[PDB]
Design a protein around this nucleic acid. Sequence first.
RNA 1: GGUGUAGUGGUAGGAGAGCGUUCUAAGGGCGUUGAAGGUCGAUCGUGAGGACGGCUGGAGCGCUUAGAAGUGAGAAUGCCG
RNA 2: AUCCGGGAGUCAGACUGCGAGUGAUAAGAUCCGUAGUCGAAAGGGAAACAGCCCAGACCACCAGCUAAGGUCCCAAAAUAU
RNA 3: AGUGAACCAGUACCGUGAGGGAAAGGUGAAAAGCACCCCGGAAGGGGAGUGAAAUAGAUCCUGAAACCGUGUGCCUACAACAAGUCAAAGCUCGUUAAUGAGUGAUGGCGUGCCUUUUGUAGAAUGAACCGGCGAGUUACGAUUGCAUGCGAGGUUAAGUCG
Lengths: 118, 102, 206, 49
Amino acid sequence: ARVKGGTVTRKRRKKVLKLAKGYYGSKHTLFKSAKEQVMNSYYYAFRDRRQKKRDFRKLWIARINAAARMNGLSYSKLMHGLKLAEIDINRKMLADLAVNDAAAFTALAEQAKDALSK
Amino acid sequence: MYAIIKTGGKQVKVEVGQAIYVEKLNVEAGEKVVFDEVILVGGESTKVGAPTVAGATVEGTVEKHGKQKKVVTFQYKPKKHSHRKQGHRQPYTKVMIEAINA
Amino acid sequence: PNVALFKQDGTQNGEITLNEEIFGIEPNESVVYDAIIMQRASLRQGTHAVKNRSAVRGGGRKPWRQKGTGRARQGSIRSPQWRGGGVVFGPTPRSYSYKLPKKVRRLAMKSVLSDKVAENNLVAVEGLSFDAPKTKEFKQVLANLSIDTKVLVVLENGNDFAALSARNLPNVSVVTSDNVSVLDVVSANKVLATQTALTQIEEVLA
Amino acid sequence: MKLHELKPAEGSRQVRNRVGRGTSSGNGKTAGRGQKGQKARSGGGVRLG
RNA sequence: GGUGUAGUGGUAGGAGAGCGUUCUAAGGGCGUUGAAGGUCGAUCGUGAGGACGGCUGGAGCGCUUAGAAGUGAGAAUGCCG
RNA sequence: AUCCGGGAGUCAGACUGCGAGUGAUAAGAUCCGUAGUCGAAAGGGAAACAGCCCAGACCACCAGCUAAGGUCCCAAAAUAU
RNA sequence: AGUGAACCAGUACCGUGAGGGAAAGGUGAAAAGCACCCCGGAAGGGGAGUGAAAUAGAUCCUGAAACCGUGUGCCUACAACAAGUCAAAGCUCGUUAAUGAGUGAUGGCGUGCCUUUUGUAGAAUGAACCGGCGAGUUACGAUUGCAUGCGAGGUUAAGUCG
């Protein structure tokens, strides 16, 4: 009882080629080229889910430094001041305030300045 | 009118009339929720309280339990003839906001 | 175990007490699975072959040289990887049949007839007589006893008019009482056995 | 027992192992034989004793 | 079923449990009011993989349970086109 | 941990502390002993870097604290006392 | 695939010779196989007709990929690029309806796949590309684990009827 290899390989290969839409040239049209490229993209995406969380933290931190130097402080002294006062705002909300509500950011910077005035 | 709340393991910015996505809650759709911990009540004048603002809550209604889009995590070691593949979809709940503390 | 008796049309002409060692003995289910599988693998005709490297009508010469030609070393026009070459490890003529020990054969026969009885699926009848072989009268008889499923008809002996009349009906199978197998009883929904044939089966299963 | 509901007894039949059918099964690419040597060849090995 | 606590990199290699192909049996189904195959889609599952809809196509094919295997391809300075 | 049984693979190692021989107390040299990493180990530091310093990836997050190493600009944090 | 050979095959073809040796199946239910006209030397094409269907027209069932073209939504002539991945304005659409789809200036990060190696991006090895084919099988013995029937016992071989 013989088993022809009819329509299984074409389905698997067309599933692979559909993931390669938008690539350059023979990297979206030939199966071997696309196979290798798709493997590399899997590697890159796993790597970059972890690197994302670092990039936004550096972005927030630099915006907060910029805002605080306008209120007579630097980033490190203002973070210490907020900790000595028991304030628990993220660096995300801090930067969001720094860009949207400058008066709220100044209220907070004054609390920090009074905390480390002791 | 602003409030900042601790939900999940993170913090969110909140407003009356707007809807928010959040980690899964253990509350069926249509029922009411109280977010106890408020970090800051902005708006016109800010209430910058040590960890939480004393006596402010935020009220809402759960609308929908869902799933995020799918993530694929695939892993291979070049030249070592081996790989392993795994999928994952993440739960969430959607909440509408009503009556920041009054 | 007592079964009711019928006539070619009628009613409850009493009952018939059958053996308890044959028709009432609590079937064993893996023994029946084994019997069915052995019998089905026993009907195969394993007549299949293919040609290996040395049977294909072909070449003993080395087709090109071993080196120099900028080629790949090849040994014959008939190698497994050449188009038109011979097959590596195909089907060969084989047997497919085996035997189970004698006590489990007998245990499976007893168990399958006893299962038929434990659900009022065996139907006993005094006699099946016919002056001519007529299919139409057999169908009337079959409806006389309200039988509407696949049925095994177990007959006695040179009751040849009945077997002729019961052929050709597409729900009906006919077997004599010296030739019942395990696969005949499992496939039918009911058994229609005559009183004579029932004692004759009790005589050989003992 | 009906011919459309067969079931062997538990533990009585096992499947089979097919070597040389991909990496993730556990036995692709050299099929359990290790790297090179007399024992990696077809018909390789030394006589008993 | 709850709840706690602990664990979950991996080549050679051992152990477990599954996905898909073709054919046999028994059962229950579909089809010119359009089967298989082909093409497109923004769909589902932890993986192999599974559906539903459009267009093409013109006569056969699924599903359940068990069985049997010429049962899975990217590489051999492989063979044919 | 020990005892009985089924199935293996390995018998080309490399560098870095430490302590010895051969060498010229030369070699990314060679041959032994003892500990680690690599082999079979991703992530941060060392410009780039198998084997050095920190640390062992089941998965999701636009949350938090630290290690080695750092804070004038490239490039996150003191133009600190 | 199955005979080397489903077809005018031990043929065409190759060799002084002995000898070696292929490729090549499918319109439609029925030839109803396109009368007549127009462009053109013809080939071929466009109407008109046959037919359920001609994009079933003889290179005739279905008609995949490589490869070659035509039309368009978005980008591109100061820029060093294993070609993607993560972040993201503008433009263009509107789906198995849901945390929608295509393209994308600009910014961070990043030396293919396989084999053999102490060790590889390797200036070590293989592959032009696409499709098909292409590798732990069976017979008879020996041993262990699991499963079933009998149990101080267990079991038949050749053969005879079927």
